[PDB]
Amino acid sequence: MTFVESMQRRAVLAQKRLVLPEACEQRTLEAARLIVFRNIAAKVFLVGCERDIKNTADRCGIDLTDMVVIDPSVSKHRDQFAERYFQKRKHKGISLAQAAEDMRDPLRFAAMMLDQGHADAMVAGAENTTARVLRAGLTIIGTLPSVKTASSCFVMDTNNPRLGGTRGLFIFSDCAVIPTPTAEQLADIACSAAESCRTFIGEEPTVALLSYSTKGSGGDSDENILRVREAVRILHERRVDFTFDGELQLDAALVPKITEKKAPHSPITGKVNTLVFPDLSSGNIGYKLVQRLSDADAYGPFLQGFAKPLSDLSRGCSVEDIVAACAVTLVQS
Amino acid sequence: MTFVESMQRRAVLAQKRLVLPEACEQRTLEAARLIVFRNIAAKVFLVGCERDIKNTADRCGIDLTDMVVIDPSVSKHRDQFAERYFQKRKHKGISLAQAAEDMRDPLRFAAMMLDQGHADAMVAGAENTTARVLRAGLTIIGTLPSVKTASSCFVMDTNNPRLGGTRGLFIFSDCAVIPTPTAEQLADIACSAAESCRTFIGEEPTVALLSYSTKGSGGDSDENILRVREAVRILHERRVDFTFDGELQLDAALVPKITEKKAPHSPITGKVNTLVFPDLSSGNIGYKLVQRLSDADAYGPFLQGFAKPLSDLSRGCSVEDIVAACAVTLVQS
């Protein structure tokens, strides 16, 4: 199958709970109906003002009978959610009443459903800004204990077995979120990209931390080189369970003859399927170069490192983009 | 007609003067022979100790007949070159006699031939470090008046006229030399890359200065975004004669449907053939991704911005590689 087909079938198998806070938006509700029709989720929670949602559904001819509308103003969890948000945020000086008002927002309320164990996967961003989506994620859901940084990746399908990797499948990370990762964040990015490789490609991760330098060739003074080198040291210190090396140029990562000249006895030779970029320009430009100048497909961006999975959509997304993002996030949980 | 054959043919038509300071190296003399045999240059100057050069030739069985040995020890330009070097370098405290000894070095002498008008193109690096070759370039030859920075590009051939560019050809720059260009340096790289587009691809240059941000989308705080935006302002101030725009994501540069959304009314829409990367990691990773994960070929790195063309070879280059480098550098004059 294709990647999208495989992710949808795996979501059907996983039978997890989806929450959608942009439930007054037509595309979101159409996606929710397709999710129900395809059995992509065990439960579909629509979060928002009940009569605004029902009104949108009425006008778009959408049956909600297998969906659960949760209204943050009326929910039985309202008081507990306001209290949990206050405890989370009181260190920034907000009041309990400000917390209660903030938790009437569908985006915050859906994120708190994940934090509190009432749903498994959240998708938003067809109508909210990326900044708002990531902020709800960072401040309500938080990160896994193994990282301090939330990041993102793309799944790159070169549609060419022979191009190395895992039958031409790669994880590229972080090509969308963190502008200039510190050495510690870069190590976090590598750890989360390793998890993404296991979830999305289904093979063991072999990770190359990339640079214009290979194992010293660029010198010892450029902070950008040292940042990547320090990340590699940090990964050794952390005793991670995946194979990794850096700093490596792309050709040293992917062409064994070159690895043998520039990085001898490197443990990644001939096996790399996960590329960690040194900064956001290199990764954002890089994945687009592969997408737009070759027959490769790029899937994502997929968020990683969050304690519970969420996705941020483009504001111009299609219904099927929403469905695809929901399936991937459900498979991540 | 391939790219290497196109350049070889064009050098034959151009009938320029080549200087080779590594004339005691066997591959260089074998290349020199092919260059004479193929009429790729009007004149082939071998620079060095005539006896060491003749000795190498005899040991290897190489005929030198239509080549001209120019011996820095006895050349009629001996005293003028020493004075010129002294004037260039006296601000570092050297004496005239030291300048004269310095100008017995074949590499320095070849570069001075370019500066003084006695040859058109220099190739070295088969047995000199890149740093040595570049330093000779910068201290002796200098840069064109339109820039203060020498840099490099690659000619990328996607082998697919629909991918954009000029029949599938692109200039990528600077993917090999400057680790973190200042805004002034990025503007210089754009100017030099536009020159290389004209020389190597043969079409009008349309230059995209790349970033993870498109026309403000990544905000106004990240210094790497501002460096690119500043370089664009600088190009406007210089009133350059090529079309440019930035900061642009790669898809906004290359995909007009996306340009119309993220960069409406951009001057580059649908015409970009020259990509300027914001730093060396993004460019070095970027060109290699295209080379290694697609059908594209990568030719270079080609130096650019020097007042007279020179080329740095790889230490392990083939004889045919040397010939191809000479032809490109001659086409560059």
Numbering used by the authors:
A (entry chain A), B (entry chain B): 1 to 333
Article passage:
As a part of the hypothesis, we have proposed that T. pallidum contains an acetogenic energy-conservation pathway that catabolizes D-lactate, yielding acetate, reducing equivalents for the generation and maintenance of chemiosmotic potential, and ATP. From these facts, we infer that TP0094 can act as a bona fide Pta enzyme in T. pallidum, and we propose to refer to it as TpPta henceforth.
The structure is divided into two domains, called “Domain I” and “Domain II” according to established nomenclature for Pta enzymes. Domain I, (amino-acids 1–141 and 309–334), which contains both the amino- and carboxyl-termini, has a central, 5-stranded parallel β-sheet that is flanked by several helical elements. Domain II (amino-acids 150–305) also features a mostly parallel central β-sheet, but the penultimate of its six strands is antiparallel. Between the two domains is a cleft that is implicated in catalysis by other Ptas. Although several water molecules are observed in this cleft, there was no evidence of substrates or products bound therein. The two monomers are intimately associated, burying 2,640 Å2 of surface area, and estimates of the energetics of this dimer using PISA indicate a strong likelihood that the dimer is stable in solution (i.e. ΔGint = −22.6 kcal/mol).
